[PDB]
Ligand binder design. Structure first.
Ligand SMILES: O=C(Nc1ccc(Cl)cc1)Nc1ccc(Cl)c(Cl)c1
Ligand code: NA
Length: 129
């Protein structure tokens, strides 16, 4: 599977952005789609994930309630809705995907090496007015 992400750019504090990530091959029942973000100077840090079969989601504390991942109703992809953005959210946002190992909870998929497949990144800079 290849992952394709939408554009980013500059946004202002308090604004929302809805990113898209689309897979080249149809989701499997075991597909997990994750979002990470590379804060400048830092590793790719986990944002949230979705389990395709159940639509179950899990998130990092730093984005809980503000960022929502959902499965597309009419495409083979997900959205990341990013609300109430602040300058500290400036990063490259990455879509990633995995196939869940039997016996491993989907919500355990929170680390970079848990995901073999990566999108190309969407750079977002949030600035004050
Ligand atoms: O992973 C997927 N689909 C998928 C769909 C949408 C998103 Cl956002 C992310 C992933 N299917 C798949 C199908 C076949 C193979 Cl070999 C593999 Cl390795 C993966
Ligand atoms: Na950090």
């Amino acid at each position: 599977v290849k992952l394709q992400q939408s554009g980013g750019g500059m946004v202002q504090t308090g604004d929302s952005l809805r990113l898209s990530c689309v897979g080249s091959r149809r989701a499997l029942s075991s597909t997990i789609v994750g979002w990470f973000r590379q804060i400048p100077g830092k590793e790719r840090e986990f944002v949230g994930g979705i389990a395709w079969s159940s639509s179950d989601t899990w998130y990092a504390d730093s984005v809980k309630g503000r960022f929502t991942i959902s499965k597309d109703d009419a495409a083979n992809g997900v959205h990341l809705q990013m609300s109430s953005l602040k300058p500290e959210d400036t990063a490259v946002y990455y879509c990633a995907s995995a196939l869940r190992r039997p016996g491993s909870d989907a919500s355990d998929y929170t680390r970079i090496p848990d995901y073999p497949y990566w999108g190309q990144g969407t750079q977002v800079t949030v600035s004050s007015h």
